[PDB]
Amino acid sequence: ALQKLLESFKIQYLQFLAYTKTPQYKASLQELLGQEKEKNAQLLGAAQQLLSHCQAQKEEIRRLFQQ
Amino acid sequence: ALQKLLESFKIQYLQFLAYTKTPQYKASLQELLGQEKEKNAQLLGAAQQLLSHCQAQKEEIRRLFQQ
Amino acid sequence: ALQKLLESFKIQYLQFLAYTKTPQYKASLQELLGQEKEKNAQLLGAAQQLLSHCQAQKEEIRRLFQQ
Amino acid sequence: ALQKLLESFKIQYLQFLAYTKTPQYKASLQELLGQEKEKNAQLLGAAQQLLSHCQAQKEEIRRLFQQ
Amino acid sequence: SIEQLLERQWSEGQQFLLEQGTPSDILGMLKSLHQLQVENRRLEEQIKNLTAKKERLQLLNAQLSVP
Amino acid sequence: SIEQLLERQWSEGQQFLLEQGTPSDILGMLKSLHQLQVENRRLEEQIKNLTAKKERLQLLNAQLSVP
Amino acid sequence: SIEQLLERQWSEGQQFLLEQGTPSDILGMLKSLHQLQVENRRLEEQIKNLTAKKERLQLLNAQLSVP
Amino acid sequence: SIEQLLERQWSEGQQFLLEQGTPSDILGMLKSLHQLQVENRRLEEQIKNLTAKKERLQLLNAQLSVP
């Protein structure tokens, strides 16, 4: 029963393994990473504002309580 | 017209002036001051708690914000 | 002793009573009331905004809590 | 290369498949489910209190705002 | 009791200082200047009230709008 | 200006009602009863202040303790 | 796309590891242990939600109760 | 224990799907795409944190600024 299965795994294995290594490798990966690095740059953005703001907030709180 | 008035002021003046100086002086004043000093002692009470509490509050705020 | 006093009260009484009734009556009163009515108009102003705002606040609170 | 791998998968397959079906089946599963159902009963607990409390809170808020 | 009679000066004095004043012009100028004086005071406090009732009510509105 | 003189009654009246009062016993009984009266009033307001300053300061303490 | 197929292992594997498992006892023991697992998770988060919704809702209740 | 082995598929599969992949180009393309993926996730949550920590911290700032 497993013979019909585990061989069909090995069918897909080379079918995609040496196959997309060639022309659909840097078509997907380099496009993926493209929007990924763009997203990362996006995130670095918000996370900045938020920390920088929570620098400003906690600074104004020191002032307003002592005042 | 004022003659009927300003004399009636002077009627009341000695009527209460040398009158209650004698037996209704330390009957009222010493009873008044009695409950007054009692009230003062009362007030000193609340005002204490409130300052002492607003010592504790502002101390725990230093802690909880730094923590 | 009071004779030197209560008569000096009556000195001031007519001294200002029939005196400023004439030329310094509507000089002061009508100037006083002038800035008074101006103040009243001022106050009616703030008290409006405050009630009108505390109409808006308590209306938006109905919304934001039910929402 | 895959031959050394996919066969070793099939080694483990029957090694645990008809093996623990027998004596280590209701030893683990029935003990697992035991503490699971206990946990579920635990969770049903907290989630109750929290909803029941957030029934009480939102009821007292209706009162205190209208009052 | 000295004050009890000290205000008996201010009451009867005011009573007849007004009474002996011109009952044609003053009856309109006084009443207006008394009525407005009180009204401008009452309005002052009611502002002071509504001042805080706004603030504290705005505090809550902030609360709801945050999350 | 009528009040300007109306308080000139209350001032000079009080001035000599006290002055003609017994300068041995009253000098101690009055001063105490004046001094305490003021002090009990000042304390009243300062309580009223600290009353709110507690409340509002306790509001913040709740805030910090919650999350 | 490697993951796309990596999860094709986990899916078909799980599909037949269960399918070849005893369909009499497991059909009851698995389903229960899957159903409860999910349910205990969903309940966990819903607690985490209601945890905060309590806190923040209790914040407001404090607010109203203060003045 | 079925999952214990179900993840043994995903681990060894991934281990050799990568290992048999081109060790020159992928070693750079994968590592980057793994490293950034994690980093973009970690950043997401840390935003979600700082999102609330801002809000709740801004709540307090409002509090202080009011009276």
C-alpha A36/C-alpha H43 separation (Å) is: 13
* Coil, strand or helix at B32: helix
Task: Locate B56 and state its tokens.
Answer: 């504790």
CA distance G39 to chain A (A): 33
Spatial neighbors of H47 by CB under 8 A, at least 6 apart, are A43, A46, A47, A50
Spatial CA neighbour of F66 closest among G58, H40, D51: G58
H13, with CB counted inside 10 A (0-12, 13-18, 19+), is: buried
**CB-based contact F57:B54 (threshold 8 Å):** yes
What is the sign, positive or negative, of the torsion defined by CA atoms of G40, G41, G45, G46? negative
DSSP string, C6-23: HHHHHHHHHHHHTTTTSS
**CB-based contact C57:E54 (threshold 8 Å):** yes
DSSP string, H20-51: TS-TTTHHHHHHHHHHHHHHHHHHHHHHHHHH
The verdict on a CB contact (< 8 Å) between G8 and A1 is no
C-alpha A6/C-alpha C55 separation (Å) is: 73
Nearest CA in chain B to C14: B2
- The structure tokens 């004050």 sit at E3
Q: How far is CA D8 from the centre of its chain?
A: 31
A66, with CB counted inside 10 A (0-12, 13-18, 19+), is: exposed
The verdict on a CB contact (< 8 Å) between F62 and G62 is yes
The verdict on a CB contact (< 8 Å) between H47 and A58 is no
Please indicate if any CB of chain G lies within 8 Å of the CB of H51.
no
Task: Locate H20 and state its tokens.
Answer: 């048999």
**CB-based contact C2:B18 (threshold 8 Å):** no
Residue of D1, D5, D28 lying closest to H1 (CB–CB): D28
Spatial CA neighbour of F26 closest among B18, C4, E8, B13: B18
Spatial CA neighbour of F53 closest among C58, B61, C50, G58: B61
Spatial neighbors of D5 by CB under 8 A, at least 6 apart, are H12, H16
Task: Locate C5 and state its tokens.
Answer: 């006093």
Chains touching chain H at 3 or more Cβ pairs under 8 angstroms?
A, D, E, F, G
Interface list for chain F against chain C, based on CB atoms closer than 8 Å: 1-2, 5, 8-9, 12, 16, 20
What is the sign, positive or negative, of the torsion defined by CA atoms of B9, B11, B12, B17? positive
Spatial neighbors of H65 by CB under 8 A, at least 6 apart, are A64
Amino acid identity, position E11: S
Spatial CA neighbour of E43 closest among C35, C46, F48, C31: C46
HSE-CB for E29 with a 13 A CA cutoff:
17
Spatial neighbors of C36 by CB under 8 A, at least 6 apart, are E33, E36, E37, E40
Spatial CA neighbour of B67 closest among F67, E52, D34: F67
Q: What is the dihedral of CA G2, G8, G9, G14, to 10 degrees?
A: 150
- The structure tokens 């507690």 sit at F54
Spatial neighbors of D42 by CB under 8 A, at least 6 apart, are none
Tell me the three-class secondary structure of F20-67, residue by residue: CCCCCCHHHHHHHHHHHHHHHHHHHHHHHHHHHHHHHHHHHHHHHHCC
Spatial neighbors of E56 by CB under 8 A, at least 6 apart, are G67, H66
A29 CB neighbour count, 10 Å cutoff: 19
C-alpha H33/C-alpha A36 separation (Å) is: 8
C-alpha F6/C-alpha F27 separation (Å) is: 26
**CB-based contact D47:G47 (threshold 8 Å):** yes
CA distance C54 to chain E (A): 6
Please indicate if any CB of chain G lies within 8 Å of the CB of H18.
yes
Spatial neighbors of A45 by CB under 8 A, at least 6 apart, are none
**CB-based contact E3:B32 (threshold 8 Å):** no
Residues of C in contact with F5 (CB under 8 A): 12, 16
C-alpha C1/C-alpha A47 separation (Å) is: 87
Please indicate if any CB of chain E lies within 8 Å of the CB of C25.
yes
CA distance H10 to chain G (A): 6
CA distance H33 to chain D (A): 26
In angstroms, the Cα distances linking H27 to E36, F47, G39, H59 are 88, 73, 41, 48
Please indicate if any CB of chain E lies within 8 Å of the CB of G62.
no
**CB-based contact C12:F5 (threshold 8 Å):** yes
HSE-CB for F15 with a 13 A CA cutoff:
9
Spatial neighbors of B58 by CB under 8 A, at least 6 apart, are F57
Spatial CA neighbour of F50 closest among B56, E53, B46, B64: B46
HSE-CB for C29 with a 13 A CA cutoff:
20
Task: Locate H8 and state its tokens.
Answer: 């043994």
Residues of G in contact with A16 (CB under 8 A): 1-2, 5
Please indicate if any CB of chain A lies within 8 Å of the CB of D5.
no
Q: How far is CA H50 from the centre of its chain?
A: 16
Spatial CA neighbour of B6 closest among F9, G44, H40, A43: F9
CA distance F45 to chain G (A): 17
Spatial CA neighbour of F18 closest among B26, B30, E3, B11: E3
Task: Locate F50 and state its tokens.
Answer: 């600290």
Residue of F2, F13, F21 lying closest to E6 (CB–CB): F13
Helices (H), ranges, A18-28: none
Spatial neighbors of C64 by CB under 8 A, at least 6 apart, are E61, E64, E65
Taking the alpha carbons at both ends of chain F, their separation in whole angstroms is: 62
Which technique was the structure solved with, according to the deposited record?
X-ray
Residue of F2, F10, F21 lying closest to E6 (CB–CB): F10
C-alpha A67/C-alpha F47 separation (Å) is: 21
SS percent in chain B: helix, strand, coil, step 5? 80, 0, 20
HSE-CB for H7 with a 13 A CA cutoff:
3
Resolution to 1 decimal, in Å? Answer: 3.6
Spatial CA neighbour of C17 closest among A46, E10, F1, D46: F1
Task: Locate E44 and state its tokens.
Answer: 């002052």
DSSP string, C1-67: -THHHHHHHHHHHHHHHTTTTSSSSTTTHHHHHHHHHHHHHHHHHHHHHHHHHHHHHHHHHHHHHH-
User: Running DSSP on this structure, what letter comes out for residue G32?
Assistant: H
C-alpha C17/C-alpha G29 separation (Å) is: 108
Please give the interface size between A and G, counted as residue pairs whose CB atoms are below 8 Å apart: 13
Residues of C in contact with F20 (CB under 8 A): 1
Spatial neighbors of E8 by CB under 8 A, at least 6 apart, are B12
**CB-based contact G51:D57 (threshold 8 Å):** no
Task: Locate D9 and state its tokens.
Answer: 């998968």
Please indicate if any CB of chain F lies within 8 Å of the CB of C9.
yes
The verdict on a CB contact (< 8 Å) between F5 and C16 is yes
What is the sign, positive or negative, of the torsion defined by CA atoms of H23, H24, H30, H35? positive
C-alpha C7/C-alpha F12 separation (Å) is: 13
HSE-CB for G52 with a 13 A CA cutoff:
8
